[PDB]
Amino acid sequence: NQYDNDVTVWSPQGRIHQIEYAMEAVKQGSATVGLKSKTHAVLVALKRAQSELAAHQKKILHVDNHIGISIAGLTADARLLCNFMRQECLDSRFVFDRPLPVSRLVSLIGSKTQIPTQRYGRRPYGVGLLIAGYDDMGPHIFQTCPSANYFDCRAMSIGARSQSARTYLERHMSEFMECNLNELVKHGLRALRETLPAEQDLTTKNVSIGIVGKDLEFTIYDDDDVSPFLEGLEERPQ
Amino acid sequence: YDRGVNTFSPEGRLFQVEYAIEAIKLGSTAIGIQTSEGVCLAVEKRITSPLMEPSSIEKIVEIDAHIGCAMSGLIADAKTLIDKARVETQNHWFTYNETMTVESVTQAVSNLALQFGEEDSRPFGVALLFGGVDEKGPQLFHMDPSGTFVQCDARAIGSASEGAQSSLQEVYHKSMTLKEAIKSSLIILKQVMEEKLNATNIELATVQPGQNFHMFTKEELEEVIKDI
Amino acid sequence: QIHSRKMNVSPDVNYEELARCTDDFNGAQCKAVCVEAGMIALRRGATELTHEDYMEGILEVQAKKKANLQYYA
Amino acid sequence: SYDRAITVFSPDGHLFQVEYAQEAVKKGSTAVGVRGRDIVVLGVEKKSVAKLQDERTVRKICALDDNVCMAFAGLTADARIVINRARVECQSHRLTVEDPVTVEYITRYIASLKQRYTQSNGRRPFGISALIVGFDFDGTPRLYQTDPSGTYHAWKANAIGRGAKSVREFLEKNYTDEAIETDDLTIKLVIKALLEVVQSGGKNIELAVMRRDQSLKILNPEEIEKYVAEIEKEKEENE
Amino acid sequence: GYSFSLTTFSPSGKLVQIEYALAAVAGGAPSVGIKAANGVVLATEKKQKSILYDERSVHKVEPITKHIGLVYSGMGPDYRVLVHRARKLAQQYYLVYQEPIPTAQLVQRVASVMQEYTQSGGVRPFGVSLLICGWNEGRPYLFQSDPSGAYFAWKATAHGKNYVNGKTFLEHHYNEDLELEDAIHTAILTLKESFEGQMTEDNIEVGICNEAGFRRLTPTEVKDYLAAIA
Amino acid sequence: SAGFDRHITIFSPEGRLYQVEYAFKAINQGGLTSVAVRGKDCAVIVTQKKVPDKLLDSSTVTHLFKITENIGCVMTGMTADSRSQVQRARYEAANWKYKYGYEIPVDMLCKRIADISQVYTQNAEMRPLGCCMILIGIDEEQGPQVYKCDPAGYYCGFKATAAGVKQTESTSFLEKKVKKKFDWTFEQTVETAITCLSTVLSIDFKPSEIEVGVVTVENPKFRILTEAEIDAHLVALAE
Amino acid sequence: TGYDLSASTFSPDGRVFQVEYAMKAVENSSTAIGIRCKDGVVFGVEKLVLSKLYEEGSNKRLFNVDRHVGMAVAGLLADARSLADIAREEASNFRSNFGYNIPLKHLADRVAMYVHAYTLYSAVRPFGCSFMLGSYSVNDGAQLYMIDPSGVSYGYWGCAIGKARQAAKTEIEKLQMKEMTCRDIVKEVAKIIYIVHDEVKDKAFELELSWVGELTNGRHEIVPKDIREEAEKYAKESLK
């Protein structure tokens, strides 16, 4: 095909297949889970292992005490956007000394990721992100795509095998809004279990959680926090 | 779909840096193990000519006394990464007056690794093993031209890395003493590379929490020679 | 339902559940799933086949399942 | 992917362009240098200055500093620009830095220069390799070589392709772990390598010997012929 | 093929791209330039796709000083850009050396200019060849600059489409001891040989360099000289 | 012919302006046509304002523009590039008046625009402006002028000229008209342009179909004729 | 084919197919309409519900940052956000230098010139959205503008961009925009939105409205369908 040069090439079909390949690179990532209540925002991650003598790749990165992120893609661009959001949060704390609202930051990332999509010389940032953030205007759970677009989701899941999760969150969204933090994290864990293969099960080693709240700063909930929340998980019947 | 890094492959991958991963295969194997007693790194030489100075191959190099480093790839990009690591650690000490923790070294090195197609080049065909004993105890990490890094209890990278890694997985566990881990790595290397091991064709390095200096081994491999 | 009509399946099988599992499946792949359930029952030497056999059939039909998708490049 | 670009990997990870640089060196002539008991000795061969051409403009050897000299094989233009770069670098570092220069730093510098000019498109890598000699390893002699791939190493003795295939094998067969007894046996081994070299007639062969305490010395054709005759006689009673 | 890029040689050691630019020179309107004992003559012809033009709204003959004549054969826009840069370069030299441009200095500098577009694929050389005449040290001189970035002198020359017959006419007709008016007559004769149709003041303009200064022929002078060509 | 036309900077083996002709073909796609005619003391421009739909506001689809209070302009090409070049012409005229102080005649403006267009033709960074230029202006104590500039950078004055799709036919009509010396007054000039266009499109135009501009020695202020004035001109030709 | 791959590469005849690809990509996007009354302008946009993972108001296609301008898009949303940013920057530049409100004609002119500037250079591509520009000025008149990714802009009594182009144009034609006020315009806009392929092949859609006029002191505000639900029920008046 002639039409697979840089994103500058418009397809006759009205597409730019580089962008679609970027979405596929998003689907190249592992399963992720993101869900909020009316008072908290929680994202749940599945840390992919490498071997019995190596550690799992981390999926949840800290940007600010009020905004958290979860990645799915080529980790290079993921970390580059992570540093970007860290810098913008710092400038927001510097100028007027105010925690940056989620929406404006996400719009800035959208513009930044869009500039490559028009301009030759740089591939668009090809990583899928889940964003958890709370501000003085509202609680937010967000996702973004390398197409330089972002979507505010009550409940969201990206990666391989994610459709079973997506069905779980679509069925249960009649429940979360006023669920407590423990119930919300249990819902997230149940959503993760849906994507699991029949031969693999959740444990502290491969599960990562991230929670932010109006009265709870964003922190990354790894093995230590995974240990108590594992109880109450839905079983695996047939 | 191979002209440059800044083009996405149909599956979402990149068929330019995946070959940079393939460049790791043509490099010599190296072994790295993290143990509670200490961190050890092993490097294969395959003596190329008796006239060479054996230490002239920089596949075993130190960036600071509390930390270790090992290489598998093109020695030029290897030396570039080595120099960058020494520079970041020395500057971190200059500004903070403390040792640069090994995880921060691995992260900060990777930003230079993240310049193949995002500034304004090409990924360096080198894969590295870091071993540090610091504020988080004994540590061993692995990093690859793709820019991803991982804390490792053990790791083997380079040519014939797959079989060595498999055997090490069968033997190693995350609660060994250091000496038996070195012995396992040594027998695996002896199995794989050429022949009966000696200082000419293998290199060894190991750093300890109580000895945050001198990972290198210089003719104390004689104990290894008489033992293994 | 159509291709299992001749195969004497156990009545306690939720074909809606199989449809839930068999995403992206074409009709030919679903027929292959039923045939694979039959062959799995034969491997068990089963007198009759059940829901579990259908799950193994899908698991063998569905896809290559692909390699470790974070270590890629 | 193919070899048409500098920065492109082969699908198996190879960089065919730098391999082509090494091979373009490999077509370049013989160049073998050794480090003796104290002295480092080199021998320039295959110049074949034909009558009308003068041998002075050949530049068989150029001295970067008083403790390091170079000639390179391959393309003379690249050799010359690298000579100028190394000379400027060593002189400027000795003049500016609080402490003077050692051969290790200039080795690192030239290796970095080759790696740099190799690193990007629109910038051809050098097609030259050279064998580095240093005097001030705390007064001890040491020997390196350099390669277009931006690669350097340390040797007791080294050669490059056209001279490598025969002469280097002859050295690895002959090289005694005892350092050549005095600069006399150092020059004797250099002349033996030249005997392993193609023609050894002395019409264009010239040598430069540096003692690692004394500065660089240049050998006259008459002394070279005398040494060659001595080595031929030594092979003569070797029967 | 090798003309796709200007930065590479052909195996035959030829720059194919530069050659095709000189083909555009052949596509240019023929111009005749010869020198006489008392001066130099630069003549050229013009035709219009329709009589709707203002044929005097532009000029093909242009000066660079009060005593320099200059004519081209190529596409107009590149010619005009090169004329602008040449005039500016002459002004810069006048500022620096406090003297007007010599003919030799002007031609070498403008040729170096026209070489400046002969590097890198992002730029294209002028499809214009220049004829330059001027007075220096009390004697007349003439040269020619071509898209190759070079120059050569000429006691008698012409270039454009159907130029070879002009060369033949100049070989068999030009002598070094001609007079200025007879030079203009020879120029209009060889232009008439070079191009078809009647040559009128709407069709030709001629500039002549006199040792004191250069001037362009007025339309009435063009009508007078073109009429009664032998 | 084929292959070498893919880039603007590449000369085809025949040495031809292929990308220039491609810009021209981009011009001809828009089904439009314009003409400018010079008179004894007047200059007249008129273009077809072929309104495609009624839901648009007719004021937002004009193609006559004032670049100077005493200079007129008329377009033929894609809307975006025409707007860009009229903005550029306005900037150039303003800059000329800023630097020199006194007037910038139509000659200077069209010459400058043609020069800049030649610049974009010369460098391969940016695509040439695929639209044509026609202007009218009064000159100091000499009379009106009509000038035509094109993507090729060609630039010249015109007693009469045409642009758009209907090039050859309109030019032939004008050529048949202009062969006779007479008092080509304002009314006669505008009538000639209008009838030229009404035959080349062969349609009985409604007044909204066209836009008429004029500049004259007696009225140097450039004017765009109103619809009622268009009807007056049409009933003048009605005889 | 061949003379197609770059926005700066001319075709052997006619114009660049890159721009044509841009406008057809605009043609397949979600529909957006905008209708102006005597003193005001009203916009209408249909949006697709994604999945239930959507958050009833997320990633909406209505954006307005100007003291008297409303603006809606019909195209790929990322380029829509970028063009909104460029429009905001241009409006702020004009407000800072000139000190007063920009005429919508000049603002649309500058934005469309920038858009077309993104089609001139081979290193950059034409945009993937088409949007409309709505405002009122007490000084000189009432205006509506429509801008495409080809850098071409026009003013309309009413216009419609999306997968409803011609049908929605006909639905505009039945109106009498010269004399109607914006209160009826909202009802007709919402009804027209619902009649033209609300969920024929699509599962379902979300409707959002924009409304700027003289009656609201020139400023733009989103007309709330949270109140009076009158256009919403007016659309359902047309189901049979």
UniProtKB/Swiss-Prot annotation, chain B:
Q: Which residues carry this modification: Phosphoserine?
A: S9, S49, S56
Spell out the Gene3D superfamilies in the cross-references: Glutamine Phosphoribosylpyrophosphate, subunit 1, domain 1
What upregulates it?
A: Up-regulated in colon cancer cell lines. Up-regulated in fetal Down syndrome (DS) brain (at protein level). May be the target of the transcriptional activator NFE2L2.
What InterPro entries would the database entry show?
A: Ntn_hydrolases_N, Proteasome_alpha, Proteasome_alpha-type, Proteasome_alpha_type_5, Proteasome_asu_N, Proteasome_sua/b
Cellular component aspect of the GO annotation: cytoplasm; cytosol; extracellular exosome; extracellular region; ficolin-1-rich granule lumen; nucleoplasm; nucleus; proteasome complex
- Identify the Pfam families for this entry: Proteasome, Proteasome_A_N
Q: Which GO terms describe its biological process?
A: proteasome-mediated ubiquitin-dependent protein catabolic process
Where can this protein be found?
Cytoplasm; Nucleus
Q: Please give the tissue specificity annotation from the record for this chain.
A: Expressed in fetal brain (at protein level).
Keywords (A to Z) from UniProt: Acetylation, Cytoplasm, Glycoprotein, Nucleus, Phosphoprotein, Proteasome
Residues modified by carbohydrate are: S185
Q: Which residues carry this modification: Phosphothreonine?
A: T48
The similarity annotation says:
Belongs to the peptidase T1A family.
What the protein does comes down to: Component of the 20S core proteasome complex involved in the proteolytic degradation of most intracellular proteins. This complex plays numerous essential roles within the cell by associating with different regulatory particles. Associated with two 19S regulatory particles, forms the 26S proteasome and thus participates in the ATP-dependent degradation of ubiquitinated proteins.
Q: By what name is this protein known?
A: Proteasome subunit alpha type-5
What is the organism field in this record? Homo sapiens
From Swiss-Prot, chain D:
Q: Changing Y152F does what?
A: Displays impaired G1/S transition and S/G2 progression
For this chain, one GO molecular function annotation is: identical protein binding
Q: Which cysteines are joined by disulfide bonds?
A: none
The record ties this protein, via Pfam families, to: Proteasome, Proteasome_A_N
* Main localization, broad class: cytoplasm
Modifications the protein undergoes after translation, according to the UniProt entry? Phosphorylation by ABL1 or ABL2 leads to an inhibition of proteasomal activity and cell cycle transition blocks.
PTM-bearing positions, type N6-acetyllysine: K226
Q: How does it assemble?
A: The 26S proteasome consists of a 20S proteasome core and two 19S regulatory subunits. The 20S proteasome core is a barrel-shaped complex made of 28 subunits that are arranged in four stacked rings. The two outer rings are each formed by seven alpha subunits, and the two inner rings are formed by seven beta subunits. The proteolytic activity is exerted by three beta-subunits PSMB5, PSMB6 and PSMB7. PSMA7 interacts directly with the PSMG1-PSMG2 heterodimer which promotes 20S proteasome assembly. Interacts with HIF1A. Interacts with RAB7A. Interacts with PRKN. Interacts with ABL1 and ABL2. (Microbial infection) Interacts with HIV-1 TAT protein.
The record, for NCBIfam families, names: PRK03996.1 (NF003075)
The name of this protein is Proteasome subunit alpha type-7
Name the species this protein comes from. Answer: Homo sapiens
Q: Which gene encodes it?
A: PSMA7
From Swiss-Prot, chain E:
| UniProt main location, coarse | cytoplasm
Q: What induces it?
A: Down-regulated by antioxidants BO-653 and probucol. Down-regulated in response to enterovirus 71 (EV71) infection (at protein level).
Using the record, list the residue span of the signal peptide; answer none if the entry has no such feature: none
The record's InterPro entries line, in alphabetical order, gives: Ntn_hydrolases_N, Proteasome_alpha, Proteasome_alpha-type, Proteasome_asu_N, Proteasome_sua/b
Q: Where in the cell is it found?
A: Cytoplasm; Nucleus
Residues modified as Phosphoserine are S3, S10, S12
Q: Name one GO cellular component term.
A: proteasome core complex
How does the record describe the protein's post-translational processing? Phosphorylated on tyrosine residues; which may be important for nuclear import.
Question: Known CDD domains for this protein?
Answer: proteasome_alpha_type_2
UniProt entry keywords in alphabetical sequence: Acetylation, Cytoplasm, Nucleus, Phosphoprotein, Proteasome
Q: Does Cytoplasm count among this protein's keywords? A: yes
Q: Which SMART domains match?
A: Proteasome_A_N
Report which superkingdom the organism of origin falls in: Eukaryota
Any idea which residues bear Phosphotyrosine here?
Y2, Y20, Y72, Y117
Entry's Gene Ontology BP terms:
proteasome-mediated ubiquitin-dependent protein catabolic process; response to virus
Question: Which residues are modified to N6-acetyllysine?
Answer: K66, K167
Q: Which family does it belong to?
A: Belongs to the peptidase T1A family.
Question: NCBIfam families given for it?
Answer: PRK03996.1
* PANTHER family from the UniProt entry: PROTEASOME SUBUNIT ALPHA/BETA
Q: How does it assemble?
A: The 26S proteasome consists of a 20S proteasome core and two 19S regulatory subunits. The 20S proteasome core is a barrel-shaped complex made of 28 subunits that are arranged in four stacked rings. The two outer rings are each formed by seven alpha subunits, and the two inner rings are formed by seven beta subunits. The proteolytic activity is exerted by three beta-subunits PSMB5, PSMB6 and PSMB7.
Protein name in the entry: Proteasome subunit alpha type-2
> What is the scientific name of the source organism?
Homo sapiens (Human)
Curated annotation (Swiss-Prot), chain G:
The UniProt induction remark is:
Down-regulated by antioxidants BO-653 and probucol. Up-regulated by bacterial lipopolysaccharides (LPS) and TNF.
Q: Where is it chiefly localized?
A: cytoplasm
Instruction: Mention one GO molecular function.
Output: ubiquitin protein ligase binding
Entry keyword annotation includes Cytoplasm:
yes
Q: Which UniProt keywords apply?
A: Acetylation, Cytoplasm, Host-virus interaction, Nucleus, Phosphoprotein, Proteasome
Residues with PTM Phosphoserine: S238
Q: Tell me, which GO biological process terms does this entry list?
A: proteasome-mediated ubiquitin-dependent protein catabolic process
Protein's job: Component of the 20S core proteasome complex involved in the proteolytic degradation of most intracellular proteins. This complex plays numerous essential roles within the cell by associating with different regulatory particles. Associated with two 19S regulatory particles, forms the 26S proteasome and thus participates in the ATP-dependent degradation of ubiquitinated proteins.
Q: Which family does it belong to?
A: Belongs to the peptidase T1A family.
**What's this protein's name?**
Proteasome subunit alpha type-3
Query: What species is this protein from?
Result: Homo sapiens
